[model samples]
Target: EPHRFPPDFQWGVATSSYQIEGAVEADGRSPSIWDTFCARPGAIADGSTGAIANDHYHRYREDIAIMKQLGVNAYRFSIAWPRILPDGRGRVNQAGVDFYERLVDSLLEQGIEPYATLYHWDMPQVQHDRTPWYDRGVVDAFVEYTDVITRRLSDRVKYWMTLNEPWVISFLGYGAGEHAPGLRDKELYLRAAHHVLLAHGKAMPVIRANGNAQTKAGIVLNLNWVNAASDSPEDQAAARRYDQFFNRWFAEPLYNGRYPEELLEWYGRDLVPVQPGDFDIITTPTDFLAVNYYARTTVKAGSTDPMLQVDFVRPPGEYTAMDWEVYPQGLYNILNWLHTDYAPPALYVTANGAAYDDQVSAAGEVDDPQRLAYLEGHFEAAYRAIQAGIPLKGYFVWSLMDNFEWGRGFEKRFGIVFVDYATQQRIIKRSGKWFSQVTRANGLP
Candidate 1:
C-alpha cells in the first residue's frame, strides 16, 4: 500500500536561532554562552563562531520564501533567549521582540504555520556563570521570558515547544563539555538537567496564561533506542542502563513525574538536584511531545569509561555522512514504546534527517540519493506508527538549510538546501526536491 499522511498533517522544516540567525550583536542583542564558548580556544572544531553563520537575521524572508517554494506548510524556529532578553531576565529588548514579531508576521503572510521553540541552547552569557541552569533564579527568568513571547505571538503561533533537546543541553553542554558552556562535571550535568526541567514546568503556566485557547505547548526530546549486543543478562542490563541515561532520564520525569528507577540506581545520591515539587512541575500537562530520533545504540555488557560504560556496537547498516548508522526501525520502535508506556501525548517527528557529503555536480545539480533513502525509510516507519494508532501529528526535517554545526563545525551538512557559506547562495539539493514533491503529494510517491 502507498504511504500517505493525513491531509491536515503538518509538513515543515526546523532551524535554530543560533544556527541560522546571524547578526548576533545587532539590534541590542547581547552575547550568549555560545558566543563566549566559541571564543574560547579549541572550543569549536573549526575555531569558528556563529557570529555570521548564515546571516539569516537579514535574509529570513528569503529563507521563508524557500520554505514556501519547497511546499512545506509549517516552519519550526527558535527564539534566542539572549536576543530577546540580553541579560536573561532584567530588561526586555524591544528591538529583539520586533525582529521575531516581523518574522512571525511574514510567516503568517506566506500561509506557513509558525512553530516556536522557546529555547535552543542560546542562553544569555550573564546567566552562564551566575544562575546557569542549576539555579532557581534561572528558572524564574525562563518563565518571565516565556510570558513575554507567548503573550505576543500566541495568537498566530499555536504550536509552542518549551525547550529543544534538553538532553543535549544537559549532557553535551554540561557533561561531555562538547557543546556550549563547555563544562565536564557529571554532577553538574544532572543538576542542569533538573533545573532545565524546572524551567520548562515554570514556563508552562506562563505560556497558558498568556496564550490563546488554540495554542498548544510541548517539549522536544532527542530519545534513542538501545539494543543489547547479545542475549546475556549483563548485556541486557547494560542496554537498560543506556536507556535510563539516554531516554528515561528525561522521559520518565516528564511523563510520570519521576526519574526512572534504573537511573536512580546508576546515579544514586547524585540525583539530589531535584527538590520538592520539581517532578510535579516538570510533568506539567504538555499538549504533545516532540521526539527527535536519529539512530539506535547497540550496547554490550560493560567497559571502563565511567561516563558511558555500556559499550556501543554499531549496527550493520548504511551510515550517514556523519557516520551514524541508519536504523529506521528504531524510529518505529520508539513511537510505539511511547504510545504504549506513556500517556502518549500527541507525537511529532520534530527532527529526523541525515547529514551527507553533498557536492554540486558539473551540471549544477546537487544529488544526495543516500539522504533521500534515509528520509524515505524514516517516513515509512512514521507512517506505520500512524497506522498502529499512535497520535502522530507532524514531521519537521532537522533543518531547512545547512548552517553551523556545533562542535563538529560546518563540516556536516544536514540541510536539504545546500548553503554556500562563502557567497551566501542557496541551492536546493535533490533530496530537497524529493521532499518538495512529497509535500506536494502529501506522501511518498
Candidate 2:
C-alpha cells in the first residue's frame, strides 16, 4: 500500500536534443534537420546516425551521474536547435552556449530539476533548408529562438517547454514524410500545423519576457488514447475523425481559442491559414500541460484517409518493441482527457515509457522485465491520475539513457538507463532499479 506522491511530485527523466546530443559537430554546432535527416539513404531504420548519441555530447557528466542514481527530482532535457542558433539566426554559439551552461550547472548540482525543452525536433539546417515549418518566416525564427533561449535559460531553468510535439512537428515532420524535414504534402501538413501553432503563439511574449518570477510556461502535447473500434455508428464517426485531426488539432488551438469545428470543416477555408490575431496568439495563458503518452489509438471505419476515412485498428494485445499496444488504460484515459478537457494549470506525464527489446545480462545485468511491467502499468496509471483529482503533477520516464529512436533508429529501446552503444556504457535497468524504488517510495511498492 504505497501509492504515495505529491510531495511536490516531479520525479523525472526524458531526453531529446535530437534524441540525446551526440555532439553533431560539437561546440560551434550546426547542421540539424537531424543532420540532414540522418543522411537520407533510407532515412534511418538503423542505417543509424545520431552520429554518436548516448555520447550525450561527451556523456552529460555520465548522464548527470545517472540522474544522481535515480533519486530523481526532475530532468526533462532538450535544447539543441543546432546547439542554440548555430545558423538558424544570428550567431551565439559560445560553445553551444557553453554546452547548455554545463548541462544546467550539472542539473542544479545534483538536486536535479531542469525541464528545459525549447523545441525537441532539432531544426536548424539553415532553418531546415528554408521550409522549416511551411514558412511564416519560421514564426520569426521561433521568436529569435525563444529570445535566445529564454535569456540564457531563464536564470536556471524553471520549466519551459515551448514545443516538443506540435503534432510530431507537423504530422511527422511535414505530413508523413516520416520525420525530419522530409516533406510529403496535405498542404504541407496544414501549413506545418499552422506554423507550429504560430510558433507557440509567438513564443509566449518571448517566454514571458525572458522568464523570471519562477517561470513556468508550457506546451509538449503528443497525446493519445483514442479507441472506437466497434459499436459502429461508422465506428463512432471514426473515433471523432481521429479525434479531430489527432486530438483536437493541437488541442483546439491551445485550450479553446478555436479550430476544431470538426477540424475546421475538415481542413477547408483555404486549408486553415488563420490570420487576424491568430486566435489571440493561439490562446496564450499557460502555466503547464505536458502529456506525451505512449499508446492507444484504436479507430475503425476504413477507406484509408482521403480525409479521415480512418483505419488503425489494433486491439487484443501486449505489444511494445514499438509495436505499441500494452495500454495501461491509456494512461488513465489520457489523464481523464486532460482533466476533463483542457483544464491545464499544471499536469505532466510528460512522457510515459516503453520500447521493450532490452537485454544485457549474463551478469552485466539489464534484465528489464518488460520495462518492469511497463513502468508498473504506467506507474499505476499515474497513481490513478493523482487519485482522480488529475493535476498529476509529473512523471517523465522516456529514456534517461538509451538514445536515438526516431524513425526507429538504435533499434527502439526506450531506456531506463541501458546504453552500451559501443561503450558509452550506462546500465541501470531492472527498470532502472524499479525506478529507484519508485523515486524513493513516492509511490508503488
Candidate 3:
C-alpha cells in the first residue's frame, strides 16, 4: 500500500514528566498529587512509584539523543507543575525554569520541535489540598500556571497543550480513585471535569497573548470508540448514552455551549457547579483538537465502572499487553466523527500506541514486528482520514520510552524504545527503525 502523506505533517513521539523524569526531589521541585497519592499503600499495582522512574531529569540529553536516532521531527513531552510552582502558585522556581530552558534549547539545537504539554495529571500537591480543580479558583490558578510556562517557552516551542487526558485526571482520579490524588466520589469528578475544561478554554488565549505568532494551543482528550452489540433500540440508546458520558460530555460544552440533556438529568444534583459564564468560557474556540485513541468497546445496556447505565463488552479482536482490543477502524471513524460533529479547526492524533511485553534478545536486539505493523495499521487509518478531507496534521506515538505506567506501574511496556530499568540501558525496538523510515518518507508502508 502506497500511502504518501503531505510533507509537512508532524511525525512525533510523546512522554509525560512524571512518567519519565525522575529526580522527584530535585532542583527546587515540590511533590505533585501523584507524589502524595503514591505514598498511600496499594495505590500502585506493583508497589512501585515514579520516584526514580527513568532519571530523565539527569538523563534528558541522552533521551533526546535517542529521539534524534529515531528520526522524529517533533517531541511531545509534559512539564511537571510542581517543578515550576512548588507551592502551586506563589514564587518562581528559577532552577526549574533553567532545567526546561535547557531542554527547549537542546531540542531546537537538534531541529526537533518541542510540543510541550502543560499538565499531564501531575498537580502540585499543595494545590490538591487547596481543593484543586474542584474549585473555580483552582481554574484561575491554572491560567496563571499556563501563562508562566507559555510566556517562557512559546518563543521557541510553538505547540502547547493545556491538559492531557482530563478524563483520567478527573474521572480516574475522583470517580474511580485510580490515578493521582486518589479519591472516589462521583460528584467530585463531575465538578473537576468542568473546571479542567474551564482551565483549558481560558488558557488558550493566555498562550496566544504570551506566545509567538506561530504558537498553536490545544487540549488532548483520551477518547475511545463505543458501539452497541445489537441493533435493538435498547442497545442503541445504551451506545448513545455510553458515548454521551465517555465522549460527548467534555466535547459538547467546549465545542458547543450545550450539555447532553439526558446526562444533565441523570447526573442531576452531582452535575457541575456551573456559574453564569461557565458555559461561555468552556465554549470558547480552541486552536485545534487532539484526540488520543486506544481501543473500542461494545455496550449492551448494563453497568460498568466507567459509565453509569451501560457497561463495556470487550470488542472482538486481538488484544494488546494492556488487554485493549486492536481496532484500527476506530481511528478512521473518530476522525470522521470529529469532522462532522463540530468541524474542529484542526485534528491531531496526539497519542496512539500499543503495549507489548517486549524484551531484549540475548544479542541485545529488540524485535517487535507486531508493534511495527500496529503503527502501519493506524497510520493507514490516519492516511484514509486525510484522504477523506480531515485536516489531520499530526500523529504522535503514545510514548518515547517505557517508564512509569501509572496505576499498573511499570508492569506494562508501551514504547518503541525499551528501557532496562535495572541497568538504565536504552535500546530501540525494531518498530522504531521501521517508524523512522515511514516518517522520513512522509508515507506509510
Candidate 4:
C-alpha cells in the first residue's frame, strides 16, 4: 500500500538512558533516583535493578548499529542528569558529558538524527534527598542543569525535549507513590507538578539560545484518552474529572496560561500553585508537542466517595500484556482534541506501542503478533490524523529494545527487539520487521 506521509517524515525509536545505560558508577556517573529507588525493598516489582540493563553504556555502538540495520532515521534518547552532574547542579562531569558526546557523534556518523530528551524521570538522587521536589530550590537547580547541557549538545542535536511525562513523575512518583522517589501526598504531588512545569519554562529560553534556529524544543506528555464508563450523569462527571486531572491540568496551564476549572474544584481554591509570572513561564512558545499514548481510560463515579469519586475501568477489547485495553480510536480523538481545543504545535507520536509475552520459535525467530497488530492499529490512527490536517510530523515506537521497565521490572516486554535478560541477547521480534516496513513506506499498509 502507498504510505501517506511527507517524503521527509521522521521514523525513529525511543529509549531512556537509565533503562538502557547500566554503567551506573562507571566514568564518574552517580546514582539517579531510579538507582536509589531500585535499591529500596519493594520499589521494583521483580526486586531487580537496572545496574546491568542492556549494558548500553559500553555497547551503545552495537545499539547504534542495530538502528542503522533497522533503517531508522532518528533516535530519541534521554540524558541522565545525575550521570552528568552528580548533585543535579554544580560543576559538570566532563567524563559523563564525553560519554554522550561520543554517542551523539556516532549517531551523526551513521546519518541518524539524534533527538535529545533532557529528563526522563531520572532525577539525581542527591537532588531528591537534598531539596526534595516541594522546595523552590529544585527549580533553580533544574534551570542550571538545563543551561549546562543545552550549551554542550544543542549545536548538533536539533530536537530537544525538556521533560518526558511530567504527569507520571508527579502523579505516579509522588501522588500514587508507585514510582521513584515515592511519596504519597496529593498536595506535594501538585507542588512537584508545578515545579516541573516551572523548570520547563525556565529551560526553554536557554535551549533556544544554545540550539540552532532549526532546533525544535518541546516536552513529551503521556496523555490518556478518557471516556465515560456509561451514559449516567455520574459516569460522565467522572470522565470529565479524569480528563481534567490527566489532560487539561497540564495543557491548560502550558497553553492557555490557566488551570482547569474542574481541577480547582477537586484540589480546592488554595491548591492552584500560582506565583508571580508562573503562568508566563509555563506559556512559553514551543516548536512542537510530543505525545506518548498507550491506552484510554473508562471512568465511573465511585459508590462511596466525595472528592475521590472517580474510578477507572479497562475498555472492552483485546489487551496488551500490560492489560491496557487496545483502543486505536483514542489516538484519533486525542489528536482532534489537541487540534481543536489547544494551540496545536507540530505534533509527533514520540512513544506509542504495547508489550506482549513474546516467544522464540525453534527456528530462532521471535514472534509477537499482538504487538504487530497494536502497531498497525495505532499507525492507522496516526494516518487518520494526518489526513485530517493535524501537523503530525512523525511517529516513534515506545522503545527500540526491551530493557528494564521501571515499576513493572523486566517481566513486561515492550521492545521491538526482545532482550533475553539471562544472556543479554538481543533478538528482533516480528513487530520490529513490521515497523521497519512501515518506516520504509512512511505509513501503515
Candidate 5:
C-alpha cells in the first residue's frame, strides 16, 4: 500500500559469498579467516559452519533463477577473495574467474544487472599473517589483487564496491574479538580501521582502470545513529562519545580528513598512527555511498568499560532476532544528516533487512509476517529520505536466502527465501512473494 518512489529508482537483492557459497575448498580456493574461525571450539553458537551453506556454490544458477522471478532489476553479491587468489597472491585461479563469468553471463541473460562487492570479510589466511590491514604491504597486495580481478571481470560488471564494511572488519573482528581473526586488541583495531580506509583509497584507481567504461565504484559502510538515552549532560556526552567511536570513526575520515576529537581523546594511548599523506589516502573520492543500516544505538552514561566509557541500553520498542532495535526513523535521520553535513555524491541502501524467527506452516509455506512488516517499515522510511531529496538511488535487501549467519552460525534467518539445508531446497517465503508483488512495477507502490 506504500508508494512514492521515483520511476527510475532501482530494486535489488544482496548476498555475500561465505554466507551462501559452501564450496570452501573447491577448485584452488584457500582458507579464509572465517573458515579458520569456524573450526575453533565454541566460536559459532550452533557449532555450524558455511561448509554446505544453502549449497549456493553448486546452486547459484537456481538462486539467480529465483532472482529473475523476484522482479528485481539488479542483484548485489560479493566475491570470495580466497577463491580468486588462493595464496592471496601469485597465480590467478582461472576456475574462480570462470565461475563468476558464467554467473554474470547468466544474470545478463535473465536481464538482471549485477552489483559486485570485491571484499566481504573473507581475507585470505596467509595475507592476514603478513601484516593484515595494519601494515602497508597489504595495501599494495590488495591493489594487485584488485587489478587482476577487475581486468578479468570488470568488462562484464559495471557496478563495483571496493570494501564491504570497514568498521566491522576492524572493530568486530580485530577490536571486539567476536568475529574471525579473533584478536581483542582495541588498540590494533583503531590502526586497522585507518589502514582499511587507506587500502580502499589506494585500490580505487586499480578498480576503475580495469573495470568497464561505465563502471561506478564505491565503498559500503554499516553506519548507525546513536540516540542519547536521556537529556542529562552525562547521557548527552556519552551519546557523543558513542557516536564518535561508532559512526564518525569511519565517516569523518572518509568524508573529510579529520578524526573526531572526542574519539581521539578516548584513544589517547591507543591512537591511530597517521602520516603526511595518510589522510589524503583515506579520503579517496568515490561515485556513491553504499549504506548498510539496520538500527540505531542508544547511549547511556556509566559503563565500567575502560575504553569509550559509554553504555548501551536496550531499545524501548520491537527488536529483531539479532536483538537489534527496530527503528526505521533512524534511516531517515542519517540520510538527511549525510546530505546536510557531508553532501555525499550519491547514496544507496546497499544492505537493509531484519533477521526473524521464520517457520514453515502446516501448508508448507514459509510465512514470515514479521520480516514482511520490517521490510515495509524500512522502505517507507527510505521513501521519506527520497522525498526530501537526499539523492537516494536504490534499495537492496540484505540477503537473498537464509544461510550461514557468521558467529551465530545458521540459526538466524534474514532472507525472504527459506533454504532447507538438509536437502538444499529453497522455498521463497510469503514475504519474498510479497516483495515480488510490490516490485511488479519496479516501485514501492
Candidate 6:
C-alpha cells in the first residue's frame, strides 16, 4: 500500500525568530529577553547568545532558495515581537517591518506558502520586567504587536499562529527559570500561563481584522503524549497528572472554554487568576491547531515534585542529541488524541525533527543517517494517523537550518540542513535531500 498525502498537505520547515534570525540589533530592533538572558551568567549552557545565530536576517534569500530546492510548499517562521515593535509598544519600526515583508515576498516569489507565528518565546526586554507574561498589561501589548504585523504581512501570509508553546513560556521561563527572563515562583508561572492564553485569545480578533479573507489564525502547542511505566494504579494516576499538566492545561481552555477541573483543583483557583469573562475571551474560535511533537514522556509514581509528583523514566532507546527518546508512535498517538478530544478544524505538526551530532564530512557532505531514519519513522507514523482519519493537514520539520537552540544554545543540530557557524555556509544534509523527494512525491516512495 502506498502512503500518500493530500494534494495540498503543507510540507514545510519551522523556525523561530530568536533562534534563527540574527542581527538582533539591526534596523531599530530592540533587545529581547534572550539578549538579556544571555548576558546573565550561567543562563545559557554554552554561555553564548543568539547575537549571530544564523544571520538569517541578512541571508534569508539564500535560505529561501534552499527551501525552494528542497521542494517544500510552506515555511513556518516566527516574527520577533521586539523587531516589530521596538521597546514593546507605541512605535513601529519601519525597517524591522520591512525585513519580514521582504522575507514574505521572497518566499511567495519562490512558490512557497508562509506560516507566521506571532510569538515564539522571545519577549521584548522592555516588556519583560514592566509587563511580563504574568501581568494582564502584556495582553494589550501582544494585541498591539499583532495588529501591527498582521496589517502589514497578512495579505501575503495567510497562516497565522498567535503564540508558540505558551506552556514553555510560562513553565520554563517563569516556573523553572530555564528560559529567558528567568524567574522561579509557582504563582508567577501559573499567572503567566493564564495571561499567555488571554493574550492569544485577544490577538485572534486583531489578526482577523487585519488579515484578508484567506487568513487562518491558530496557536502552536508542544503537546507530549505520555505513558505510565507500569499498569499499577499509582503509575496510571501519575501519568494522568502529567498529561493534565502538560497537555490539557493549555488545550482545554482553547477548545472547551474552561480549564480542566481536576487540574484547576490541583493548582488551586487563586493561582490561576481567572478574571470575569476570561474564559469567553480565551475560547474565541480558532482556525486550526499547530502541534509540536518531539517525544512521548514515560512516567512513574513517587516523585518529590509537588506540582506533578511524577518521575520521568527514560526507557532504553535511541535518543537524540537533545536526549529525547525516538518514539514516532508518540506523534501518531498525539494526533489521534487531539482529534478525539478537541477536534480542531485542522491540525499541523508545525515542529518535528531530531537533533543529531552532525559533522561535515571530508567530502563536504553532511550525511545524517540517524536523523533521516528518525524523520522517516515519524513520517510513517504521521501517515498512519492520517489514514486513521485524524485531521492532520501538514508537517513542518523543526528547523530549516541549524541555529541557536534556546537554553541549550547551539550545541544541538536539529536542522535537516547543516549550518557552519564560522563561514555561515549551509550544506543540506542527507535527510534534507530525502525530504526533497518526500515533498516532491507527496508520499513515501
Candidate 2 weakest ten by summed lDDT = 260-269
Residue 429 lDDT, candidate 4, scale 0-100: 86
Q: Candidate 5 clashing pairs?
A: none
lDDT of 4 by residue, 1-445 (tens): 5756878888899999999999889988888888888987888999999999999999899899888867889899999898789867788999999988999999999999998999898888888887666666778888888888889987789999999998898888888888988888888788888888888888999899987789889988889789999999989988888888888778888899887876676787575566999999998999999999999878899843344577777766888888898999999999889988875769988999898998879988998988998988988888889888898888888889998999988888899998887887788888998887877777766
* Model 3 lDDT per residue over 1-445, tens place: 5789988999999899999999999999999988888888999999899999989999999999999988889999999989998888988798998889999999999999998999999989898788577777888888888888777777788889889988888888888888878878888888889889889988988989997678888899988888898888988988888788888888888788877879778778446788888788887778789999988878887766444777667756788888887889999999999999889979989999999889789999899887887888999999999999999999999888888999989988888889999988989889988887888889875
lDDT of 6 at 182: 92
TM-score of each: 0.98, 0.34, 0.97, 0.97, 0.97, 0.98
**Residue 163 lDDT (model 5):** 90
For all candidates, what are the clash counts?
Answer: 0, 1, 0, 0, 0, 0
Residue 165 of model 2 has an lDDT of: 82
* Candidate 5, 1-445: lDDT as tens digits: 6575888787899999999988999988889999999998878999998877887878989999899778888899888889889889889999988888888898988888889998899988988888677676777888878888889888789889989899898888888888888877877788788888888899888887786568898899888878999999999999998888777888898888988976787687346878789888878888888999999889888865557777889866999999999899999998888889889878999999989998888888998888998898988888889889899999999788898989999999889999888788888988899889777765566
Q: Among these predicted structures, which one has the highest TM-score?
A: 6
Cα lDDT, all candidates: 0.88, 0.83, 0.87, 0.86, 0.86, 0.91
Better of 2 and 3 by lDDT: 3
lDDT of 2: 0.83
lDDT (tens digit, per residue) of candidate 6 on 35-147: 99999888889888999999999999999999988999999999998888888988899999999999999999999999999999888998877899988899998998999
Candidate 3: stretches off by over 4 Å: none
List clashing residue pairs in candidate 2: 80-83
As a whole number from 0 to 100, the lDDT of residue 329 in candidate 2 is: 85
Local lDDT at 278 for model 2: 85
Q: Tell me how candidate 1 scores on lDDT.
A: 0.88
**Candidate 5 TM-score to native:** 0.97
Error of 1 at 208 (Å): 0.5
Which ten contiguous residues of candidate 5 have the minimum total lDDT? Answer: 262-271
